Ligand binder design. Structure first.
Ligand SMILES: *[C@@H]1O[C@H](CO)[C@@H](O[C@@H]2O[C@H](CO)[C@@H](O)[C@H](O)[C@H]2NC(C)=O)[C@H](O)[C@H]1NC(C)=O
Ligand SMILES: *[C@@H]1O[C@H](CO)[C@@H](O[C@@H]2O[C@H](CO)[C@@H](O)[C@H](O)[C@H]2NC(C)=O)[C@H](O)[C@H]1NC(C)=O
Lengths: 50, 50
């Protein structure tokens, strides 16, 4: 939202292509690929005596 | 592609917002929600004395 309001002519970094982000600025092609994954602690597979 | 090359001023239909399509044209707000699902045959688990 600063790039739209002319404060920074280009934001370089971890900026991730979302749909309303592509409306207001105009990205390049992606230079790395990312997706949301879920990390969670590893645990046992067995339940109760039930 | 026939809106970028200005043969049509507006494509009204079932056009789905993808992150190239938001890049080359402008969309409205999403008036209906959609997502890719996987349809498949149901489980027909039999039950008989056979
Ligand atoms: C998608 O991104 C746009 C761009 O920032 C968001 O629109 C802005 O929303 C803030 C809310 O405080 C306000 O400054 C304005 O309504 C918008 N800024 C503009 C037009 O410069 C929009 O809210 C985002 N969508 C969602 C669902 O969060
Ligand atoms: C991304 O979307 C665009 C639009 O369909 C495609 O990129 C180019 O778009 C121009 C329109 O001005 C066409 O003339 C080019 O032929 C398109 N490039 C190619 C290689 O066909 C592009 O097809 C889309 N990206 C992907 C991966 O399909």
């Amino acid at each position: 939202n600063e790039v739209v309001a002319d404060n920074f002519d280009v934001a370089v970094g971890d900026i991730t292509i979302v749909t309303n982000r592509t409306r207001y600025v105009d990205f390049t092609q992606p230079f790395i690929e990312s997706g949301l994954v879920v990390v969670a602690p590893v645990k046992e597979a067995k339940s109760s005596p039930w």
